[PDB]
Amino acid sequence: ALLSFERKYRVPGGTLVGGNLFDFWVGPFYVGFFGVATFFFAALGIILIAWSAVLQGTWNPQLISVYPPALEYGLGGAPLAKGGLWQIITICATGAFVSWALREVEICRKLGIGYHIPFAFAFAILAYLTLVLFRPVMMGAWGYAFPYGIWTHLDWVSNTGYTYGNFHYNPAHMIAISFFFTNALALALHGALVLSAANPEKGKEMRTPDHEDTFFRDLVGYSIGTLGIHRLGLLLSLSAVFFSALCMIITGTIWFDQWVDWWQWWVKLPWWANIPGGING
Amino acid sequence: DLASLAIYSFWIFLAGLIYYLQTENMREGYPLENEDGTPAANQGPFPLPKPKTFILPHGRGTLTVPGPESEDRPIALARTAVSEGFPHAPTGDPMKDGVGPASWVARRDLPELDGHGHNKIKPMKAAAGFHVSAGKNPIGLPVRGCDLEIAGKVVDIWVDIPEQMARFLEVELKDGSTRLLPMQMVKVQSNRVHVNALSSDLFAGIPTIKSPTEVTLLEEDKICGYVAGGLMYAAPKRKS
Amino acid sequence: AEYQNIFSQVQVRGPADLGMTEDVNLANRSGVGPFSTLLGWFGNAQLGPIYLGSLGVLSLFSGLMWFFTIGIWFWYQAGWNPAVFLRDLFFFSLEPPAPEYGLSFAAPLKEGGLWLIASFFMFVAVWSWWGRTYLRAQALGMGKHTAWAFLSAIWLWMVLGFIRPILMGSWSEAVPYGIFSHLDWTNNFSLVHGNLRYNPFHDLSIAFLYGSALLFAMHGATILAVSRFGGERELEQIADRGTAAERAALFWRWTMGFNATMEGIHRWAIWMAVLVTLTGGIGILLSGTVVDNWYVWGQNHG
Ligand code: BCL
Ligand code: BCL
Ligand code: BCL
Ligand SMILES: CC[C@H]1c2cc3[nH]c4c(c3C)C(=O)[C@H](C(=O)OC)c4c3nc(cc4[nH]c(cc(n2)[C@@H]1C)c(C(C)=O)c4C)[C@@H](C)[C@@H]3CCC(=O)OC/C=C(\C)CCC[C@@H](C)CCC[C@@H](C)CCCC(C)C
Ligand SMILES: CC[C@H]1c2cc3[nH]c4c(c3C)C(=O)[C@H](C(=O)OC)c4c3nc(cc4[nH]c(cc(n2)[C@@H]1C)c(C(C)=O)c4C)[C@@H](C)[C@@H]3CCC(=O)OC/C=C(\C)CCC[C@H](C)CCC[C@H](C)CCCC(C)C
Ligand SMILES: COC(C)(C)C(=O)C/C=C(\C)CC/C=C(\C)CC/C=C(\C)CCCC/C(C)=C/CC[C@H](C)CC/C=C(\C)CCC=C(C)C
Ligand SMILES: CCCCCCCCCCCC[N+](C)(C)[O-]
Ligand SMILES: CCCCCCCCCCCC[N+](C)(C)[O-]
Ligand SMILES: [Fe+3]
Incomplete structure (x- = not known):
């Protein structure tokens, strides 16, 4: 059929x-x-x-x-x-x-x-x-x-x-989760924005994209716009999977110790490495 | 116990939701049809939803879907086989007839409006304020089709006012008339605007519009239909 | 060398767009922010106006009070030393009252008190903001969709730092405020409830998280694929179906034997994302209140 x-x-x-x-x-x-x-x-x-x-x-x-x-x-x-x-x-x-x-x-x-x-x-x-x-x-x-x-x-x-320990410390993995979570945020916002404009309060007329642009601007001071949010969902999603692959191709290969220790590169920087106090002093 | 209750209950809710969601995606294109347009025997397991009505905004009426669904036009295709499920070959010119990848839908022959009730797409020449803010301004450049021949000169940019984006380039042909070409099907280059979909001789066939300060939804569809369709029907006169 | 429509080739600017009026009190809108040509290649170049009413002022002020309260604590952990503060930025952590103080508000300021103060400010910040979500829709005559979906996100957060902690008998269960500390809290919670993959709501939440990436990829990609026919003007393809909506649906019908509509895809889209935190929040809340070990539970199923 x-x-x-x-x-x-x-x-x-x-x-x-x-x-x-x-x-x-x-x-x-x-x-x-x-x-x-x-x-x-x-x-x-x-x-x-x-x-x-x-x-x-x-x-x-x-x-x-x-x-x-x-x-x-x-x-x-x-x-x-x-x-x-x-x-x-x-x-x-x-x-x-x-x-x-x-x-x-x-x-x-x-x-x-x-x-x-x-x-x-x-x-x-x-x-x-x-x-x-x-x-x-x-x-x-x-x-x-x-x-x-x-x-x-x-x-x-x-x-x-x-x-590798708590794998949360893989830094490519952190970026990846960021994009997964940000994707989900965005997909709920997109679904809800279009729906709410197409199904307004009872009896009222279908809202428009301008209303869509106004609602986001009123709430956070910026609206990506209808071309932009389909661009944004694509990017967020693909970037999640890309960082996912990247967080794993580097694991067991360039880095194979515990990912929590990888962060010592930052704390062991000369200008504050030996300064007393903090968590690592 | 409570956790297995929550999970038992959750599977029941998810099945209800898929059902609700799938029937909600039946408000267009249904009921299913055989290739001759009559109602199919097997419609699937999801029943059509009770109708709903959208109140359209600038006195343009309502929309109730599902509703009796008609193509509002002649389809120039015939079967190529004696049984279900094969391709339907165009009976004339698929670019002119508006079929295949050159299709169009009989949308309302009024232009889209913003929330203020003003036409949404206007040529920049009459969009007070509006100018090109970044990137190569295409206005003035030669337009080249996929045959590597010039078909025209870009004479303006049609712009979405409310959304502030470039929607069409207005192109001028050898005879002095104009055609609208979708932004997304052109390539703005430093010394030219290249159109991979159409050959220089198919620019004259692009569906024209009745007024020069506005475009209707029916015309957009004929325009976009016609240039996308060139990707398949302009293949012979394409090169690289 | 066919254009892809991921970035705009030409940008266009016109008079600032101030929006729609209706029942919106225009005295609470700011003016327009500047325009960003950088943003402009991907989305809209205009920043503002923003609507900053009293609920928003309340919200923004507590939001910052919460962040500053955490930030003050961080400096005290750093012995007010700039280089230290940057060095160990991800190591600082504002932890909640130890177990012995229960649900009491007695634990001292530096051992729980500040945590509670922070949470309070976060509490009113989030809930004020949710109200706003609703109220800004209401002023525009739009559906309450953004607020009902937000509630779902709210569900996870409420369960994590408020409901579970109360049902468990102590604020010690709540999540600490810190970058590495919240990751350790997360790992920790998991090793104690035996096998986080045998919590069925945890699994489903994962199915919806990945499913949200699959669905936004499908959706986003589909609207760009038919943006050469006006595809991204969704409300009008809902109101008067065009060839964008048609070839969109038929791509999917020919690929996987069923499809959506311009309106329905957004219903699929809002449920896929909401379910993530809906099922996740149930998963967490049940953990240690009803079920101490999802592996055991999965062996009996009770
Ligand atoms: C205890 C375990 C560790 C851990 C160890 C790992 C490991 C180990 C891995 C991840 C990976 C991931 N983790 Mg981690 N992770 C942890 C904690 C987390 C937390 C959390 C809340 O704590 C989160 C949110 C994440 C998040 C993530 C994602 C970034 C990533 C997986 C998504 C993905 O790759 O899809 C990408 C998409 C796919 C793999 C699916 C593609 C499918 C194909 C194309 C088609 C299938 C068709 C099929 C046959 C169906 C046909 C039949 C029917 C017709 C349908 N992790 C803890 C700390 N994590 C994985 C990842 O990065 O992979 C690179 C990975 O390998
Ligand atoms: C990607 C990161 C890790 C990983 C981490 C996790 C985590 C963590 C979890 C899963 C879970 C699942 N994973 Mg996995 N998974 C990986 C790689 C895969 C691959 C793959 C080909 O690469 C596939 C097919 C799956 C498939 C699946 C599903 C069985 C299950 C729910 C997935 C879902 O909703 O996706 C979202 C996609 C959609 C909604 C589209 C629907 C896709 C369908 C449902 C997949 C059916 C596949 C089928 C069982 C495979 C057999 C095919 C037959 C040969 C025909 N995983 C890698 C190794 N996977 C969850 C689980 O519930 O297991 C019990 C879970 O919590
Ligand atoms: C080592 C750790 C354990 C583990 C322990 C946990 C625990 C513990 C939890 C999860 C949860 C989740 N896990 Mg797990 N998880 C593991 C392995 C995985 C794997 C994997 C590939 O192996 C994956 C893919 C996941 C994936 C996921 C998610 C689906 C889910 C979180 C959804 C979400 O969006 O929360 C992000 C969304 C929120 C936190 C809500 C945000 C809402 C509030 C209101 C926002 C406030 C903002 C505020 C005001 C600040 C403003 C800042 C701005 C700048 C303004 N986990 C391993 C085995 N997982 C969560 C859950 O639901 O489990 C059932 C959770 O609690
Ligand atoms: C940014 C990437 C995101 C994404 C996008 C994406 N996925 C896609 C697409 C896109 C754009 C499609 O066009 C396509 C689709 O058509 O959806 C309906 C697809 C698709 N994504 C799918 C699954 C899928 N995608 C996932 C993830 C993602 N997809 C990302 C998050 C996941 C997970 C785990 O997150 C899954 C499970 C399929 C539904 C579908 C492609 C269907 C397909 O290829 O059919 C071909 C093959 C078969 C019918 C089965 C062959 C299998 C056998 C040869 C043996 C079994 C193989 C074996 C690996 C089993 C594994 C067992 C598991 C228990 C581990
Ligand atoms: C369906 C579940 C998904 C979801 C949905 C969702 N989230 C939502 C919504 C929805 C539907 C909203 O409507 C609401 C929204 O308004 O977004 C625009 C929201 C939102 N989700 C947010 C975050 C969020 N959502 C997340 C997750 C999810 N949200 C899920 C994936 C996550 C995670 C961890 O994955 C986070 C972190 C907020 C953007 C917003 C709620 C805003 C709010 O409540 O804040 C109150 C006001 C303030 C706290 C102001 C505080 C200021 C800052 C804390 C300080 C500034 C920080 C910055 C780094 C610099 C600071 C400046 C100073 C130095 C001067
Ligand atoms: C640069 O230094 C200055 C001073 C300029 C700064 O501003 C620096 C500031 C910082 C460095 C700020 C850093 C802030 C963070 C690191 C915050 C980290 C945040 C997370 C990782 C949080 C994760 C999870 C949070 C959760 C689950 C919150 C739950 C909150 C609650 C549901 C609240 C429940 C209510 C409570 C307990 C109060 C009870 C009492 C009542 C009356 C209601
Ligand atoms: C009442 C006139 C004063 C308001 C003018 C100031 C412009 C601020 C606009 C905010 C835009 C920025 N934003 C929201 C992205 O942060
Ligand atoms: C995880 C989502 C699962 C999707 C399952 C929905 C089944 C699709 C129903 C299509 C059959 C109906 N049809 C084509 C006859 O209309
Ligand atoms: Fe969309």
Whole structure:
């Protein structure tokens, strides 16, 4: 089926690979060559994960877990049952994600819109790739990669942070949380500003952007403006994930001690290092 | 105990909310249709919401959605296959017919208004106060399409008064008439303004507007429709 | 070399914009601030006017009284020495009354008293400001959305330094005012309630935090992608749907088999962000009042 206004946009063209071969939809779904590609990698991965499940013992989705090659194999291959499945699935995950992004580029070309969505999706993909590929290669083994299980990937988050102390002291991590938290702030403010102007007090007429500009100016003395807040949400979000990847590519690689000690660089500055008093005197 | 009550209750609230939210995103484009425009058999599992009405502000009326939804115009496309789900090929010229990436929607043929009731977009030539404050002023520069040929000269900047932003460049063609081109589809360069979407010969086809001091929402849509659509339909006469 | 619309290529300035009047008392608005060309490439160049009524004056004054009260304390920790104060800026911490003073207001000024004084000033600052959020909307005839979402943020903060501490029987539980000290408080709270990943409200709050980044990325990116059709003029695409709204929706329909509308996306957007602190605040409040160890709880489920 089609939304009521869609038929005019369902024309041929925009595909990057295959010409007309996969230029069609299945229900609402567009399928390019890359829709075929995401299905292939994703159904392999789902299959190999199911396969990993049987060797493990269970069918419980909350117990299923697939671990990477123990540190002992470094960046070499490994037997399927001991990190081989994780290596193939990770390739499939990479394939499924990259394919999804390029399919997105195909939908953009057909629709005549900017590529900004797939580009933004690529920051998530790079964060994923940093945990499963960029860190571990730099670190000399697949084994520093997180496992794939609902609750074991969480265990791995802790285990890997407590290897450095309170991971709160990673300074790239601090910037990253700042952007996550600031993103959430902004998304609540945006949702609420547009809504409140479109659904005014009962009986009143729909408010306008000017009213939107006035409300923020009245409250904090500044309004970013409708082009600006969509720019701002994009930036805040992408910067969060970028600082996330950066806070982790530098961990276990240029810095591997306890992140709380990294801050000694500042306190040990000559002009106040030896001055008595304070917390560090 | 209290924590498992809170969690049990929370899942019920979240399911209610997804439901509310999904039906709220059914106030446009629904009910779903087959490719011929009739109502589809399978509408999905979320029922259309009870209608709501927006009171529009400068005597422009109301909007009640959902409501009987009509494209308010002819669609120049035909099927390319004997069954559901394939592409619909344009029956004439997709740039002129306003289909595909060149589409447009039959928006109200009145211009948008600010909160004071004045047209929101005006050419800078008549926007008292308004001047270019930073960046290369484009007014006066030659305009080049994707064929690497000049199509025109920038003669003004159409500006959003309330929001104080550049919205369109007003371009002049060889014959002396003008066209509005979206700011977001042009590239302001030091000695030229480059338009990647249109070839020099498609500038004359850009939908004109009735008055020179205002643009209606219907015209914006025909304008933006037409230049975005060139990205696909101008491919042959594009180069680099 | 196609323009992206992340930064403006040309800026335009006109008469200062003083806003909409209505029922807003124009005697409480300032004049216009200056214009920033720096801001101008990304957002609006105009600063001000700002509305500084009596609730705002009250709010701004306590806000600063709270910050100064913390700041005074920091200087006393530094033995009034500038180089020390900068050196150890992140190490100072204004801690609350030790456990023995309960919910009492007896603990001495330098061992809890100042903390309480600070919190009081923060209390009235936040709650005054929330009132403002409401009152500024009310004067413009707009919905109360900004205030109901703010309440959710408020929920987390209230639980953290006020509700939990009261239900737990002491102000010692509250959060200290300091950069590293609040991070240590955070780590600390976690090691004591056994496994912060087995608190289900904590997990959900995380799902909404990341989900808020995914949703603002999707949304922001989508409006820029259709800004070549007027996309960011949302209220008018809500009131009279155009090709911006259409190709926006159909990008998502073709990508993931469903979509939103210009109005509905903002409903999705406000709930994604609000739920973060809504579920987080429930997670915290329950911690140590009802459930001492989320791991144990997760083994029994009671
Ligand atoms: C005890 C543990 C430590 C700690 C250890 C770590 C560790 C260890 C890590 C973080 C990382 C992060 N931490 Mg920390 N962290 C702690 C305390 C915190 C606190 C807090 C309140 O104290 C906060 C707010 C954070 C905040 C954050 C974020 C900055 C960052 C994770 C977001 C992210 O990377 O997304 C990026 C996005 C993704 C990874 C997802 C991308 C997904 C892909 C592209 C697609 C998936 C499709 C999928 C298959 C679904 C298909 C099926 C259906 C169709 C849907 N940390 C404590 C101190 N933190 C992580 C990070 O920085 O990663 C770089 C990281 O590795
Ligand atoms: C990013 C920083 C750490 C990390 C830290 C955390 C923390 C901390 C938490 C989670 C939690 C979750 N993580 Mg994680 N997680 C990481 C990397 C990932 C990746 C990945 C491919 O990179 C994925 C798919 C997930 C997936 C998930 C979900 C199971 C769960 C809720 C997520 C959510 O709402 O996102 C927001 C996104 C959306 C709302 C879109 C919906 C996406 C859906 C829901 C994901 C379903 C994935 C599915 C189970 C994977 C199997 C796919 C099949 C093969 C088809 N994590 C890295 C290692 N993750 C939370 C949890 O509840 O676990 C119990 C939690 O508290
Ligand atoms: C080592 C630490 C523990 C941990 C312990 C905690 C604790 C403890 C808490 C969280 C909480 C949160 N954690 Mg955790 N968390 C860990 C690991 C993680 C990981 C991860 C990748 O591993 C992630 C992604 C998170 C993510 C998150 C967030 C979703 C959540 C906070 C939401 C928020 O916006 O609060 C930021 C928003 C606010 C604090 C509210 C602000 C509101 C007020 C009103 C503003 C006042 C402003 C004032 C007047 C000053 C003005 C200054 C200006 C200049 C004017 N945690 C580890 C295992 N986490 C919080 C929670 O909800 O948990 C359930 C919390 O209390
Ligand atoms: C700034 C980056 C933020 C962001 C943006 C973003 N995400 C995006 C996009 C954008 C712009 C999309 O366009 C795209 C989307 O289409 O959403 C509907 C996407 C998307 N983000 C998703 C998830 C996601 N994004 C996340 C985060 C973020 N996304 C950031 C915060 C997170 C987390 C954890 O924070 C998750 C979980 C998907 C919903 C969706 C892309 C869907 C997709 O690629 O389908 C292709 C593949 C499959 C159907 C499944 C294949 C899987 C198999 C091969 C095996 C399983 C792999 C394995 C890794 C499992 C891991 C298990 C876990 C328990 C750890
Ligand atoms: C839905 C949950 C998210 C959310 C939502 C949210 N926050 C909100 C709102 C909403 C909907 C508001 O309406 C309200 C708002 O007004 O923002 C513009 C607010 C707001 N959220 C704020 C902060 C905040 N929100 C946060 C989080 C969140 N808010 C969540 C992510 C966080 C964190 C930690 O992540 C913070 C830190 C404030 C900007 C604002 C509430 C303002 C307020 O209440 O303050 C009272 C007045 C004062 C305190 C004045 C104090 C002055 C300063 C303390 C001193 C100056 C500091 C500066 C460094 C220099 C100082 C100058 C002096 C030296 C002269
Ligand atoms: C440069 O030096 C001068 C003097 C110029 C300065 O101004 C320097 C100033 C500083 C260096 C300032 C620094 C300020 C900070 C470091 C503040 C740090 C803030 C955080 C990290 C705070 C985190 C969390 C806060 C929480 C959860 C607050 C909770 C507050 C409450 C809910 C309040 C509850 C009410 C109380 C306890 C009072 C009870 C009594 C009643 C009557 C209601
Ligand atoms: C009554 C006339 C005096 C007001 C003129 C002073 C200008 C201040 C404007 C505040 C703008 C700045 N802000 C809010 C971003 O901080
Ligand atoms: C975390 C959010 C989960 C989103 C789930 C909502 C399901 C989408 C419903 C779309 C099906 C309806 N349709 C297309 C027939 O209208
Ligand atoms: Fe928006």
